[PDB]
Amino acid sequence: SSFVEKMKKTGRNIIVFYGSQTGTAEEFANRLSKDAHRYGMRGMSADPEEYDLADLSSLPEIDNALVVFCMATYGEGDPTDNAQDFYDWLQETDVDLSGVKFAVFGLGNKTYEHFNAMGKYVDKRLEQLGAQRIFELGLGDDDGNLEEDFITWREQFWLAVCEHFGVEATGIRQYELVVHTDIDAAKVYMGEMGRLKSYENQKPPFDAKNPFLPAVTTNRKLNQGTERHLMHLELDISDSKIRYESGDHVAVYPANDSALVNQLGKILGADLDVVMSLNNLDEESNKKHPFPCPTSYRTALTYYLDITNPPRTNVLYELAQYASEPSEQELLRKMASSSGEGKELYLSWVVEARRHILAILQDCPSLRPPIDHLCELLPRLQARYYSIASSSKVHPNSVHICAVVVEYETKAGRINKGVATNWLRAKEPVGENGGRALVPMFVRKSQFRLPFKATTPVIMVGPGTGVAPFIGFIQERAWLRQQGKEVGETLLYYGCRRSDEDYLYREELAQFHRDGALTQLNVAFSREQSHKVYVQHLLKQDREHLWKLIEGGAHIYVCGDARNMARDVQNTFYDIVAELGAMEHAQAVDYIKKLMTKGRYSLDVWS
Ligand SMILES: Cc1cc2nc3c(=O)[nH]c(=O)nc-3n(C[C@H](O)[C@H](O)[C@H](O)COP(=O)(O)OP(=O)(O)OC[C@H]3O[C@@H](n4cnc5c(N)ncnc54)[C@H](O)[C@@H]3O)c2cc1C
Numbered sequence: 001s002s003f004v005e006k007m008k009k010t011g012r013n014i015i016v017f018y019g020s021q022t023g024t025a026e027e028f029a030n031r032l033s034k035d036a037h038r039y040g041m042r043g044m045s046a047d048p049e050e051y052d053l054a055d056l057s058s059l060p061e062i063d064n065a066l067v068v069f070c071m072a073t074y075g076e077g078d079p080t081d082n083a084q085d086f087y088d089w090l091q092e093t094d095v096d097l098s099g100v101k102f103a104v105f106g107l108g109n110k111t112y113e114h115f116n117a118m119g120k121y122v123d124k125r126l127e128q129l130g131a132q133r134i135f136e137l138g139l140g141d142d143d144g145n146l147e148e149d150f151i152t153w154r155e156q157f158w159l160a161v162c163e164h165f166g167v168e169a170t171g172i173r174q175y176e177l178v179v180h181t182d183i184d185a186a187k188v189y190m191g192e193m194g195r196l197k198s199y200e201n202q203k204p205p206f207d208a209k210n211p212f213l214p215a216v217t218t219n220r221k222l223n224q225g226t227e228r229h230l231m232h233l234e235l236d237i238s239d240s241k242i243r244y245e246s247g248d249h250v251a252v253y254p255a256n257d258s259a260l261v262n263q264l265g266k267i268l269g270a271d272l273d274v275v276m277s278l279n280n281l282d283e284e285s286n287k288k289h290p291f292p293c294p295t296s297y298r299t300a301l302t303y304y305l306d307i308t309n310p311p312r313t314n315v316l317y318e319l320a321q322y323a324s325e326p327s328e329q330e331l332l333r334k335m336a337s338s339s340g341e342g343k344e345l346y347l348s349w350v351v352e353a354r355r356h357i358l359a360i361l362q363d364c365p366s367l368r369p370p371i372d373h374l375c376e377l378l379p380r381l382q383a384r385y386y387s388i389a390s391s392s393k394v395h396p397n398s399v400h401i402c403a404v405v406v407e408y409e410t411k412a413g414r415i416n417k418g419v420a421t422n423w424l425r426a427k428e429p430v431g432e433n434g435g436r437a438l439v440p441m442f443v444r445k446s447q448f449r450l451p452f453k454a455t456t457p458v459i460m461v462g463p464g465t466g467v468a469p470f471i472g473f474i475q476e477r478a479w480l481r482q483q484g485k486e487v488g489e490t491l492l493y494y495g496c497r498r499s500d501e502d503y504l505y506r507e508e509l510a511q512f513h514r515d516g517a518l519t520q521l522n523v524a525f526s527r528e529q530s531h532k533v534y535v536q537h538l539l540k541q542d543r544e545h546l547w548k549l550i551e552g553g554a555h556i557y558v559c560g561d562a563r564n565m566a567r568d569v570q571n572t573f574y575d576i577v578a579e580l581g582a583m584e585h586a587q588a589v590d591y592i593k594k595l596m597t598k599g600r601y602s603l604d605v606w607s
């Protein structure tokens with residue numbers, strides 16, 4: 001099916017494709033799509049996977065055609081899975097795109113190696129093919145505030161649109177509510193993703209759309225201290241046909257705090273147990289419902305919607321119309337402004353204060369919107385990825401997780417709890433008579449991998465939870481040694497605050513070093529002396545040996561905090577290569593960056 005014909009038969013001149021893995025780019029495209037209306041135009045948003053972009057050459061057949069791309073970048077500057085077909089096409093095609101008018105807004109994070117590689121490539125590639133750029137590439141940075149980057153871009157975009165096409169700003173619910181009163185409890189979604197009763201009746205293959213319900217066999221606290229809670233879980237995937245390797249990620253679909261959900265109901269004065277359905281008013285769309293329907297409000301707010309994350313500007317704007325108090329409405333209304341005091345208050349009152357929806361309704365009492373509209377505005381609750389801490393060579397039937405619970409106090413005087421980590425923390429291991437706890441998950445393949453050759457040495461840097469994939473790495477290297485194969489050096493550079501507060505897998509690691517599996521265990525305690533001692537410090541001290549391994553062909557792996565750690569560790573490695581390779585700093589940078597392309601300097605960082 002040609003998206004161009006689709007556009008002709010539905011009267012649309014604007015099409016916004018989205019490359020998204022966790023919904024953000026998708027939401028951004030939907031917002032741009034709805035925006036067309038204010039300019040006498042008609043837009044639609046679309047998943048490029050459900051189409052064939054070769055059809056872009058046929059875009060000129062629509063008067064005033066305009067295509068916009070909202071694209072997120074993932075692993076190693078690669079495209080999202082739903083944009084992979086698009087990517088591959090752009091790399092092999094040489095079609096003349098003269099007459100095609102486009103604009104690209106890339107979603108990225110500058111703490112990653114290839115910043116907005118996807119957006120940059122699409123934008124650069126369409127021009128090469130002859131397309132005409134209607135407005136500059138947008139560089140959204142989720143390390144700063146993607147939302148602000150977006151509204152800033154959006155504003156300038158439409159102005160360019162008005163200018164080039166000669167249109168003007170002439171100066172709405174997407175769904176409609178249907179309360180299912182006579183429904184059979186059996187036809188109601190209870191939190192499953194995908195087909196109805198998929199949880200109750202499990203059948204492979206399990207993926208993001210059909211998550212497996214494993215049994216939590218273990219859930220134990222890893223840290224000795226008590227300042228934080230670091231836990232180690234083991235999920236039994238027996239009978240799932242699911243495969244994985246150390247380095248892969250497990251994604252989980254969490255549930256919101258029952259208490260938080262109950263408070264939202266109460267403050268909105270709404271029976272959360274009412275079953276209902278929200279139907280897309282756009283008869284032509286694929287997205288019939290914002291989430292599985294019919295379903296009760298409670299279920300929606302617990303399994304399908306994001307109620308903890310600080311709301312984006314469009315959500316605060318719509319809500320404004322439900323605040324009777326004058327000063328309270330003024331406050332919410334301005335929060336959507338491009339800049340000025342409106343932008344300042346947003347960043348301050350919403351973002352920095354980290355106010356979730358309930359905190360907003362509490363700190364703006366006059367706000368009393370209907371629960372069904374909110375359900376339409378809120379983002380879908382996303383799964384959380386964790387680096388499997390087990391090797392499929394040793395635990396083929398189990399998936400291990402190592403995580404730190406997220407809990408902190410806000411400026412707003414409240415106590416925020418991380419969705420997936422507090423949820424995971426409360427999962428009770430299977431009991432002699434226990435109750436299977438539901439931990440909806442699926443595996444996500446990655447490029448993070450042990451060397452093809454067991455003889456190849458490995459340098460692993462993972463402070464804090466970043467130690468996660470390495471537990472599996474060391475598990476496998478031991479297994480290999482037990483298999484009688486020759487195994488090169490296996491060094492781990494771990495780090496934490498204090499040896500009595502949060503040293504993870506202390507016993508397991510020490511035993512591995514005694515068995516000979518873990519060649520070297522080097523740990524940096526950042527808080528046992530006035531000055532901070534980090535992993536990069538230990539790396540420098542060992543500059544001599546590391547350079548030898550590096551020059552010999554060893555593989556480097558960095559996992560954990562991307563914001564600072566990754567940056568410091570890479571800088572030290574530049575240092576090591578420059579000083580001992582005798583080359584210039586900029587040559588060392590070239591050098592290290594080339595190891596990445598050879599797959600010998602792998603990264604698994606997050607924030
Ligand atoms: C590829 C990848 C691999 C990962 N691997 C692991 C892993 O193996 N182990 C692990 O523990 N995590 C890992 N994560 C992180 C994990 O996916 C979750 O982000 C993390 O567990 C928190 O999720 P949550 O739902 O509990 O918290 P959420 O409800 O999602 O809250 C997270 C947000 O809370 C805010 N926040 C946290 N602390 C503060 C603070 N003190 N002050 C202000 N704001 C704060 C930040 O905005 C943070 O993004 C990984 C992430 C990625 C992307």
Ligand SMILES: Cc1cc2nc3c(=O)[nH]c(=O)nc-3n(C[C@H](O)[C@H](O)[C@H](O)COP(=O)(O)O)c2cc1C
Binds near residue numbers: 024026074077
């Ligand atoms: C596993 C993972 C890998 C990422 N890799 C990159 C990357 O290489 N470059 C970049 O600029 N941003 C990277 N990001 C950040 C995302 O591009 C950014 O968070 C984007 O807003 C996500 O959009 P989505 O919700 O539409 O998928 C990564 C995020 C995750 C979670």
